Design a protein around this nucleic acid. Structure first.
Length: 49
DNA sequence: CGAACCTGGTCTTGACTCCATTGCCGGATTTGTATTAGACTGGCAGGGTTGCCCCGAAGCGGGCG
């Protein structure tokens, strides 16, 4: 998700199935980190995904 | 036949000129330092891009005392 004048973010898929959410080129932290960081609960994560 | 001469220099003496060369001296400018009393208290800031390779370091699975 490359913008004009901003920071980057990538949602890869590893050799395993853990979707890596490397933000501003600081690799780790699968998607639930960003989702519950956004305020999403495990119920809504189960519902949409 | 000798003799003046006339003129190359070779050199000196004496007066004159003229400009460096310090030397103060008075002032001009140049450069350095000190001091300003209301109150003020943790940066802006700019980008992330290749490919390939080597190798050294961090961290994690996996057994072991």
């Amino acid at each position: 998700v490359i913008p004009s004048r901003g920071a980057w973010l990538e949602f890869d898929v590893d050799k395993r199935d853990t979707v890596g959410v490397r933000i501003d080129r600081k690799r780790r932290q699968p998607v639930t980190v960003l989702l519950k960081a956004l305020g999403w609960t495990s119920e809504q994560i189960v519902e949409r995904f």
